[PDB]
Amino acid sequence: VPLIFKIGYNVIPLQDVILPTPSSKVLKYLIQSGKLLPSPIFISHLGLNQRRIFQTNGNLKTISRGSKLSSTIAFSTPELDEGVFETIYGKFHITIESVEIVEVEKLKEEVEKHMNDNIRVRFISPTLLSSKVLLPPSLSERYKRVNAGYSTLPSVGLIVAYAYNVYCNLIGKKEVEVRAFKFGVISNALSRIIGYDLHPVTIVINLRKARGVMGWIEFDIPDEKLKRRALRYLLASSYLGIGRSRGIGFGEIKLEFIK
Amino acid sequence: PLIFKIGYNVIPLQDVILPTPSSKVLKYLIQSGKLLPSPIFISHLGLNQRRKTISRGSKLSSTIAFSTLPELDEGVFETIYGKFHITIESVEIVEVEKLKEEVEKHMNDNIRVRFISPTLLSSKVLLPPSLSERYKRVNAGYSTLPSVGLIVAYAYNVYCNLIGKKEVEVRAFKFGVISNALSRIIGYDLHPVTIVIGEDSKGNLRKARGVMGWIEFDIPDEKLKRRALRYLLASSYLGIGRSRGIGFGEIKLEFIKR
C-alpha cells in the first residue's frame, strides 16, 4: 500500500551556528550520508518564529546555541531515529515533533469533509511555478524560444495544474501535459477568488537567482466535480510541496479550509 | 473610424449630491441630447485625480471616449443633480491605423496596466466556448485577481468592436490562454473592491465585486506582444470589462523603458 510520510523535526544547535544556503542543507547532509534516514521528496528550509530561513540575499544568518529550529521532510511510499548529530555545519540535537502517515486513499476521504469549504493556499516558502504548464502542449515547439520564467502571480489554474502533476507522480501514474493544461484552463475560467496577499520574491537557488511567489490566496471552485478533483490534488501537494526545487525546500504550501 | 477622447472640467455651481455611479451626471446630458448628438466610455467624475457631497466650485474632471465629425460645445448645463459648468480640457483624436504605428515604439518596453476605476472582468471569457452550455449554471462572477490573459482577452474584444468586427469568443479564449502561458509578470499591486454599480430595473441597489490596482508585465514573444499592444492601446481609450459606458474598467496604460 503506497503512503506519504511527513516528519516534523526539532533541530537544536548545541553551539552558535551559521546555517548554510539553503538551510535545508543541514538535514540533507545527514540524509545523504545515511545518518538520518536510509536514502517525490521534500526537505524544508529550517524555520524559526514561524518563518523559513531562505536566502534572498543579505548577510548569512546566525543562530544561537539552544534555538528551536524546525524542519519538515516529506516523501512517498523506513524507520527513523533522533539524537545528537555531528555535521560540517556543527552539532545538532534532532528530535521528532510529529509523524503523519497518510494512505493515498485516505486523501480522497478527507476531500469530502471540505466540499462546502473555501480553499486557502499559503506559500510558506518561495514557490517557483512555470507558466508554460498552461501552454497548450501542441504549441510547445512554436514557443520553444520564449522564456516565460516562473510566475510571480500564479493563477488558481496554474496552482492546481501543478498539484495535479504532483498527484499523478504520487499515485505512480505518468503525468499527462494535456490533462494538466485542460484542468488549469478550466479552473481559471470557473474559480472564484475570495481574497489574497501575494508578492514576488527573488531567492538564491557564483550566485544563481530565481523569482517566484509567496503569500496566500483564498478561493473556491463552484463546480462539484472539479472541486473534488482540485481538493484531492492540493491535499497531496500539501505534503510534497509544489513547483521547482522542492527537494531543497521551495514550494512549501500549507492548505487551509475556511468554513 | 476615429477615436475621440475628450477631457472635461465639470464644476458644480451649487453644492451637489452626486449620483451612483457619478458618471450618471454626464450620461443624463448625453442621453437627453444636450452634450453630444447620438464603443462608448463615460468616466466617473474625479476629484484631486481620484475617481458623495461636493461643494460649489470644486473642479471635477471627466473623460468621455467613443469611436466613429466634431460638434461639441461648452458652458452651463442643467441637470436633475444640479447645474454644472462644463468646459473642455483636452481633445485627442486618434486614427485606428495610427494605433498600429505606436505599437512599434513599445516593442521593447514593459507594459503597465492600471485599473483607475473598479474593473469588472468575467473569468468565463477564458472558458473554452464549447463548454459554455455545460457550465451554464456556474456563477464565477467577476475576477478579483485577473490574469494577464483575461486582461488582454478583454482588450481584444474591445478592439474588435472598435474596428466594427464581431468579437469571436474562440479567438479571445485562445489569445488569453496563450497569453497566460507566456507572460512574465514584473510587479503588481492589486486588490478586490466591492462597489455599488447603480440601481436596477426595480430601483434596488446592485453590488459587484471587481479589481483595482496595477499590474506590470511583458510578453516575450514578438508576434503575440504586437497583437497585445494594439488591443491594449485601444482599451486605453474605451476602457475594459463590463459597464464601461457607466465608467467602470477605466485603465491607464504605461510603457516602462528598459
Residue numbers in the entry:
A (entry chain A): 1 to 39, 52 to 89, 95 to 222, 229 to 282
B (entry chain B): 2 to 39, 52 to 64, 73 to 89, 94 to 283
Any passages from the paper?
Although native SsoCas6 crystallized readily, reductive methylation of the surface lysine residues was required to produce well-diffracting crystals. Residues 43–50 and 90–93 are disordered in each of the four monomers in the crystallographic asymmetric unit. Analysis with the PDBePISA server indicates that the four SsoCas6 monomers in the asymmetric unit assemble into two identical dimers (complexation significance score of 1), consistent with gel-filtration data that also suggested a dimer. The dimer interface was formed between the C-terminal domains of both proteins with an average buried surface area of 1349 Å2.
In type I and III systems, pre-crRNA is processed by the Cas6 endonuclease, whereas type II systems utilize an alternative method involving host RNase III. Cas6 proteins typically consist of two tandem RRM (RNA-recognition motif)-like folds {also known as RAMP (repeat-associated mysterious protein) domains } with a diagnostic glycine-rich loop near the C-terminus. In the present paper, we report the crystal structure and accompanying biochemical data for Cas6 from the crenarchaeon Sulfolobus solfataricus.
